[PDB]
DNA sequence: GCGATCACGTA
DNA sequence: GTACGTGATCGCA
């Protein structure tokens, strides 16, 4: 049973509580509250937003830090709240990064999903009361407010036994103080959003579209044909069976297409080197381009992230309408659009501030290799240094392709790509890729030690930890097939270096919000891209940030290592290097 | 409309 | 054959 309330009382402001606050529309941002669910030690209330909203006392409580709240994915709740003006405070317990810290493989996304985490299953899945996609649709108040009830009531039932799992695994701190607090300066990041201009994004537009179809006309002469060049089938047909083209790797369905394969096929007709200059340019214009102006706000002219803190596998956060994490840097023209991001208010700057190896130097502590650590301890160029040991030769006879070479290992560990990632990257034979390998194991033993025992630890214990107590549970790591046992190995030397990693990150992010605030500064974080803070400030701010924000991300932890950040600012994210 | 598929951008 | 998010095509309704 619970109360329909009309009129917000009393007893519905206890100072704990399951709170709901729904928001349906997937992207939160000045969205719809659809209702809201109150369960404490006096009773079960849904409220109408529109009552609840309006009423000082709920209104002060909501706001009270004090009131300690439990809530399934409070960001959401408070970002919404953020753009009605009214704040969301003493969140002390949020479902979602509880599930998330035991487990993220579940995929856990609503109460429901969690709930069965515990064999509790008085709750529907969000989608079976909203419905899918197109027949998406918020129900009547009676069916409504069951839901919001029981997924209240399930928050109430489920804090304790989360709480208790969480301790055992040595996860309470990280609940209670990094994910929980971060998810605040998240949600602040999210509603302040990054100012964009519009006009140089659009005039940047009308300049690939004229170099788009110049090159596309190009296509069709050098096919003799019009075609949708977009449709990787319709242009299999020409480049390998009209242009005889010779086909080097299959797809599932027909043929590779990839710029992979086509610029091997580059010497044997022009066609190709234009094929991947459309391409090119076509990500730019329909990803970049059309992709940011269709999600920048006309009222803010900003964009509005959500940040997704409960996604990876490895703790990283990934970003959503616009992804921000993927916006181009390795080729000019492509990072050119990173000009399009201004500060969001005149006489700011943009200041960006990035770890430099930070994956490597976590490798180093964690493995705890002495010729690793001393790179690092030399502040040496890692890429350099590896080609060094790997070809047994002194700095001066590092030639660039023994760096790039050096280059692709040391990422390959970071990222824990395979034997035969390697070897597809570099393009060289897979036994090539092999004794490449070795010769680094040979090089830096520590990391070899490191990679075997962290294999043998997630075989025994069913995991791998991060070092601020994160886990990924790997139970392929068993599997009598090869290939699903090797990606299992390799996520688990791969995850407790990425998976602390972010971890250090978000610490950053914490320890930064809260000296800004001390310093009195106006300086605010804008975006966290892995690696990356960036951050708007008045001009005036721009040296004691150039102090601040390094020392914050370099005393965050305490490894055998140096951190080192970089950092540049800019009257745009392009010019922030 | 909705998925499966391919391709590609970042870290 | 790493972490993910997005756009296009395409075939089946």
């Given at each position: 049973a619970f109360t329909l309330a009309d009129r917000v009382t009393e007893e519905m402001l206890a100072d704990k509580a399951a709170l709901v606050v729904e928001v349906v529309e997937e992207n939160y941002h000045d969205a719809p509250i659809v209702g809201i669910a109150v369960v404490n030690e006096h009773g079960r209330f849904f409220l109408r937003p529109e009552t609840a909203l309006a009423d000082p006392q709920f209104?002060?409580?909501?706001?009270?830090?004090?009131?300690?709240?439990?809530?399934?994915?409070?960001?959401?709740?408070?970002?919404?709240?953020?753009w009605k003006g009214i704040e969301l405070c003493g969140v002390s317990f949020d479902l979602l990064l509880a599930a998330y810290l035991l487990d993220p493989a579940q995929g856990v996304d609503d109460v429901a999903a969690?709930?069965?985490?515990?064999?509790?299953?008085?709750?529907?899945?969000?989608?079976?009361?909203?419905?899918?996609?197109?027949?998406?649709?918020?129900?009547?108040?009676?069916?409504?407010?069951?839901?919001?009830?029981?997924?209240?009531?399930?928050?109430?039932?489920?804090?304790?036994?989360?709480?208790?799992?969480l301790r055992r695994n040595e996860q309470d701190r990280l609940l209670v103080e990094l994910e929980q607090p971060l998810s605040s300066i998240l949600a602040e990041m999210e509603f302040?959003?990054?100012?964009?201009?519009?006009?140089?994004?659009?005039?940047?537009?009308?300049?690939?579209?004229?170099?788009?179809?110049?090159?596309?006309?190009?296509?069709?002469?050098?096919?003799?044909?019009?075609?949708?060049?977009?449709?990787?089938?319709?242009?299999?047909?020409?480049?390998?069976?009209?242009?005889?083209?010779?086909?080097?790797?299959?797809?599932?369905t027909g043929y590779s297409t990839s710029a992979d394969v086509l610029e091997k096929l580059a010497p044997?007709?022009?066609?190709?080197?234009?094929?991947?200059?459309?391409?090119?340019?076509?990500?730019?214009?329909?990803?970049?381009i059309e992709g940011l102006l269709k999600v920048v706000r006309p009222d803010t002219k900003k964009v509005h992230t959500i940040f997704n803190q409960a996604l990876t596998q490895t703790g990283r956060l990934s970003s959503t309408e616009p992804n921000l994490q993927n916006i181009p840097?390795?080729?000019?023209?492509?990072?050119?659009?990173?000009?399009?991001?201004?500060?969001?208010?005149?006489?700011?700057?943009?200041?960006?501030?990035?770890?430099?190896?930070?994956?490597?130097?976590?490798?180093?502590?964690?493995?705890?290799?002495?010729?690793?650590?001393?790179?690092?301890?030399?502040?040496?160029?890692?890429?350099?240094?590896?080609?060094?040991?790997?070809?047994?030769?002194?700095?001066?006879?590092?030639?660039?392709?023994?760096?790039?070479?050096?280059?692709?290992?040391?990422?390959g560990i970071v990222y824990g790509i395979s034997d035969y990632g390697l070897a597809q990257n570099l393009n060289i034979s897979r036994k090539e890729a092999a004794e490449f390998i070795e010769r680094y194991f040979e090089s830096f033993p520590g990391v070899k030690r490191y990679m075997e025992n962290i294999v043998q630890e997630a075989k025994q214990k069913g995991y791998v930890t991060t070092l601020l107590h994160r886990r990924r549970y790997?139970?392929?790591?068993?599997?009598?097939?090869?290939?699903?046992?090797?990606?299992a190995e390799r996520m688990a030397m791969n995850t407790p270096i990425q998976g602390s990693a972010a971890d250090i990150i978000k610490k950053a992010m914490i320890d930064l919000n809260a000296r800004l605030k001390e310093e009195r500064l106006q300086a605010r974080l804008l975006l966290q891209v892995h690696d990356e803070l960036i951050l708007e400030a008045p001009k005036e701010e721009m040296e004691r940030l150039c102090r601040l924000v390094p020392?914050?991300?370099?005393?965050?932890?305490?490894?055998?290592?140096?951190?080192?950040?970089?950092?540049?600012?800019g009257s745009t994210w392009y010019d922030a290097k």
């Open positions: 209104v002060a409580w909501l706001g009270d830090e004090t009131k300690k709240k439990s809530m399934f994915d409070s960001k959401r709740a408070a970002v919404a709240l953020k969690a709930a069965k985490m515990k064999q509790y299953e008085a709750v529907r899945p969000d989608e079976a009361v909203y419905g899918k996609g197109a027949k998406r649709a918020v129900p009547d108040e009676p069916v409504l407010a069951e839901h919001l009830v029981r997924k209240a009531a399930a928050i109430w039932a489920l804090e304790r036994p989360f709480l208790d799992e302040a959003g990054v100012k964009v201009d519009t006009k140089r994004l659009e005039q940047m537009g009308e300049e690939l579209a004229e170099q788009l179809r110049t090159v596309e006309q190009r296509i069709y002469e050098l096919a003799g044909q019009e075609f949708n060049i977009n449709s990787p089938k319709q242009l299999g047909v020409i480049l390998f069976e009209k242009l005889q083209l010779p086909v080097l790797k299959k797809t599932k044997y007709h022009e066609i190709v080197e234009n094929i991947l200059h459309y391409r090119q340019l076509g990500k730019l214009q329909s990803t970049y840097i390795r080729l000019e023209e492509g990072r050119k659009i990173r000009q399009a991001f201004v500060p969001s208010e005149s006489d700011w700057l943009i200041f960006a501030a990035d770890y430099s190896q930070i994956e490597l130097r976590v490798l180093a502590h964690i493995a705890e290799d002495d010729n690793l650590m001393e790179a690092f301890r030399r502040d040496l160029d890692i890429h350099t240094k590896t080609a060094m040991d790997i070809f047994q030769v002194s700095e001066d006879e590092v030639t660039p392709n023994m760096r790039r070479q050096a280059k692709a290992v040391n990422f790997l139970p392929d790591i068993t599997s009598r097939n090869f290939n699903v046992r090797s990606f020392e914050v991300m370099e005393q965050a932890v305490t490894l055998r290592v140096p951190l080192k950040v970089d950092y540049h600012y």
